[PDB]
């Protein structure tokens, strides 16, 4: 008994600046691909989607635009908000979405604070792995080795603070479990005292978990190398969840005059990143997205990043939940019901299975990259962690 | 020549009287100012419509401003007063700036509201911000030739008053090159007084602290047992607003520890705001006290800095609105109005009030110390006048 056609209004809040992996032009092709995929069926026939793409400016702008649109539309609110991804941009929008009972899905907002959804962040469903998920994986990695202490070394912008929130994910989990952590932060955009960093590391712990730009990490590793810290006395880890495809070929390589030392230095470094699966569907998905972005004037990874994949799946998940709430006799305006429907379930995303936990946070799967052959400087994945299963396993 | 002005005011403060700046305590102050105003710098007939909304010292302040503006029946208020709470105020200030609406508060004392080049361009602070207290501490340190300090405060991760308070000191000191050791704890959790005192014992001789007065009495008691009172250490606590806490005999509780506390406090100095009075202030206080008691509540004797500042907030707004209307602009030119509230001195109900070139009220402070240990008598020992930037001990 097909319901009446629906007119779903979605507001996309991401950066216009293509410097970000989750900029509007980079993500739009994926959202459109998923909408294309949904209309031919779970929604009432004749249903249409109106999508507004708005610049979040990775900041206060996201909130301003949300508010301005509602006011201009005389109180009318979007039916679905996608993004922001930036932590400080997302928190105010999440607060309002919860207050207005609107569903908000994001492949970002990875910070630990969004974990508490009793009130403030009710209504936020995270479609990509939050930092605490990477933290749980690090705990398992530590339990695997029987390690119980670590030095956390990260760059803190005091602005977007991506690496600060990343390591907060580790700190939170480790503190819960009782592992000891030494904390050392610095601002990598300022003049660096590479020797003070390395000296603090040698005075604190032997297992070091770091997060900073690929070049800052390289600088730190080259300096640790001259202090004789790269031959086995320390176990370094760096976190590169969103762009770690340089490995296999050599994340140390820079066609630089420090290339050989870097390759040696990196024999003691392991890199944590997202375990990314593939299907022929995902492969096609990437090609189309890549083409669209390319004739748009942008370069792009060969396999669309997690933010892009995440947002594609965010639409499938919204439609999935909306379809169920509709069939149950509720409306698209019952945001809380839509949000609860997106939680605690497994569905088929563009790259495979996707499971959202009972707190509305996607389970993450992670891989560990290590140098498997020091002569060549070959880096491969030595082990994975499957979040839902909660098990870490070294690869055969 | 000019028609009656109808100014819509949105006041965002806590309904909960647990706060010294709750709606009940501050409303009387705004009303008093309103009368004084409506009877004249503004075209006669001019009337203010004031909406008092619960800020809940949190997210609700944002939700109320937006629900009022983005409603189908909505419109932008002409003036926003409050929030006071730092996390409640940040979002409102950003919006006020985006919507070109003037925002005045006796709160938003944190250092971050200092940078007004962009997001906080439409906020003028009528009460002394924490950095102003930090400037006073810098002058006090220079006076003694002190160059290092231990900052020890409670950080509850919620309203974080003491964290923001010592941040004012930290900012000024780092800028100036003085070294500070940092030690935070959550007083809302079981205290590890032994660790606190041992950490102090090992860091610096001058200790600047901020925590509830009972948290401070405890620290001081353990320090007393460790022989740290009586000379070896100079302790300071910050009690800028609550008169029950900076009043003479801050060590007394009618406790079984009252004697030890009096002796311990001989080494403690308290920083608070240097307040002034004049005939009118008394009337204002009497009148304010009247409404508040009629509203079923125990008063705090004379009114705190928030009540005073919000009364002066109205007056400063009017002065700015005048000189702006003159220049031919409207109440809707928030940016223009705010610029007029900056870099000027006017008469508040307690005495002269000066707002600096960045839209922040200049602050005067006093240091209270025990001048008679047998008696446990505490008196003002020195003052700091923010605008002149001079610290001076009293005769």
């Amino acid at each position: 008994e097909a319901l009446p056609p629906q007119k779903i209004e979605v507001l996309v809040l991401l950066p216009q600046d293509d410097s970000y992996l989750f900029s509007l032009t980079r993500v739009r092709p994926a959202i459109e691909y998923a909408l294309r995929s949904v209309e031919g069926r779970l929604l009432p026939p004749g249903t249409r989607f109106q999508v507004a793409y708005e610049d979040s400016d990775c900041g206060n702008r996201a909130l301003f635009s949300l508010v301005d649109r509602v006011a201009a539309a005389r109180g009318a609110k979007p039916d679905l908000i996608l993004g922001p991804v930036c932590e400080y941009a997302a928190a105010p929008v999440a607060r309002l979405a919860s207050h207005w009972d609107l569903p908000m899905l994001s492949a970002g907002a990875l910070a630990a604070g969004f974990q508490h959804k009793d009130s403030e962040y009710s209504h936020l469903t995270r479609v990509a792995p939050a930092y605490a998920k990477m933290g749980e994986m690090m705990l398992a990695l530590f339990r695997h080795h029987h390690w119980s202490r670590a030095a956390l070394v990260y760059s803190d912008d005091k602005l977007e603070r991506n690496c600060y929130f990343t390591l907060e994910g580790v700190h939170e989990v480790f503190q819960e479990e009782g592992l000891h952590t030494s904390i050392y932060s610095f601002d990598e955009t300022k003049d660096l005292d590479l020797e003070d960093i390395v000296r603090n590391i040698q005075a604190s712990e032997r297992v070091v978990i770091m997060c900073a730009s690929s070049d800052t990490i390289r600088s730190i590793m080259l300096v640790a190398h001259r202090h004789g810290m790269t031959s086995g006395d320390y176990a370094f880890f760096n976190i590169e969840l969103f762009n770690s495809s340089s490995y296999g070929d050599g994340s140390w390589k820079r066609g630089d005059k420090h290339d050989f030392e870097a390759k040696q230095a990196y024999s003691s470094l392991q890199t944590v990143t997202l375990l990314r699966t593939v299907k022929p569907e995902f492969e096609k998905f990437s090609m189309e997205v890549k083409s669209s972005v390319e004739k748009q004037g942008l370069n792009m990874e060969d396999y669309v990043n997690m933010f892009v994949e995440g947002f594609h799946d965010a639409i499938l998940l919204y439609v999935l939940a909306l379809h169920e709430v509709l069939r149950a006799g509720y409306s698209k305006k019952d945001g809380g019901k839509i949000i609860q429907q997106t939680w605690n379930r497994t569905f088929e995303g563009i790259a495979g299975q996707v499971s959202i936990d009972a707190n509305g946070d996607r389970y993450g799967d992670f891989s560990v990259i290590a140098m498997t052959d020091v002569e060549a400087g070959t880096q491969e994945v030595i082990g994975d962690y499957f979040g839902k299963e909660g098990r870490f396993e070294m690869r055969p | 020549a000019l028609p009656p002005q109808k100014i819509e005011v949105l006041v965002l403060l806590p309904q909960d009287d647990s706060y010294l700046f709750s709606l009940t305590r501050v409303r009387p102050a705004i009303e008093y100012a309103l009368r004084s105003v409506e009877g004249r710098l503004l075209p006669p007939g001019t009337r203010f419509q004031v909406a008092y909304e619960d800020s809940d010292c949190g997210n609700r302040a944002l939700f109320s401003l937006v629900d009022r503006v983005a409603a189908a029946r909505g419109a932008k208020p002409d003036l926003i007063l409050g929030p006071v709470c730092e996390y409640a105020a940040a979002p409102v200030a950003r919006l006020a700036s985006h919507w070109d609406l003037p925002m005045l508060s006796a709160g938003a004392l944190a250092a971050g509201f200092q940078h007004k080049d962009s997001e906080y361009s439409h906020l003028t602070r009528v009460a002394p911000a924490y950095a102003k207290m930090g400037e006073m501490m810098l002058a006090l340190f220079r006076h003694h030739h002190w160059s290092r300090a231990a900052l020890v405060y409670s950080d509850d991760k919620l309203e974080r008053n003491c964290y923001f308070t010592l941040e004012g000191v930290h900012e000024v000191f780092q800028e100036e090159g003085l070294h500070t050791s940092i030690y935070s704890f959550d007083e809302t959790k079981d205290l590890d007084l032994e660790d606190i005192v041992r950490n102090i014992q090992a860091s610096e001789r001058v200790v600047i602290m901020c925590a509830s007065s009972d948290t401070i009495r405890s620290i001081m008691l353990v320090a007393h047992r460790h022989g740290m009172t009586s000379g070896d250490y100079a302790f300071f606590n910050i009690e800028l607003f609550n008169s029950s806490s900076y009043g003479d005999g801050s060590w007394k509780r009618g406790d079984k520890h009252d004697f030890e506390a009096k002796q311990a406090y001989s080494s403690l100095q308290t920083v608070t705001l240097l307040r002034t009075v004049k005939p009118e202030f008394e009337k204002f206080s009497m009148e304010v006290k009247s409404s508040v008691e009629k509203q079923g509540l125990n008063m705090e004797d004379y009114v705190n800095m928030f009540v005073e500042g919000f009364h002066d907030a109205i007056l400063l707004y009017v002065l700015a609105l005048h000189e702006v209307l003159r220049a031919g602009y409207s109440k809707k030119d928030g940016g223009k109005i705010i610029q007029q509230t900056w870099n000027r001195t006017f008469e508040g109900i307690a005495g002269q009030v000066s707002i600096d070139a960045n839209g922040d009220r200049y602050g005067d402070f006093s240091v209270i110390a025990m001048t008679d240990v047998e008696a446990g008598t505490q008196e003002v020992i020195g003052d700091y006048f923010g605008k002149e930037g001079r610290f001076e001990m009293r005769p």
Binding site: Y88, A112, Y164, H171, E176 | -
Partner: peptide, 18 residues
């Protein structure tokens, strides 16, 4: 440690020093 499983409110401001 600039951390401590707290400060959920990390939003709407930044100031300096943790």
């Amino acid at each position: 440690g600039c951390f401590g499983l707290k400060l959920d409110r990390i939003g709407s401001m930044s100031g300096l020093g943790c």
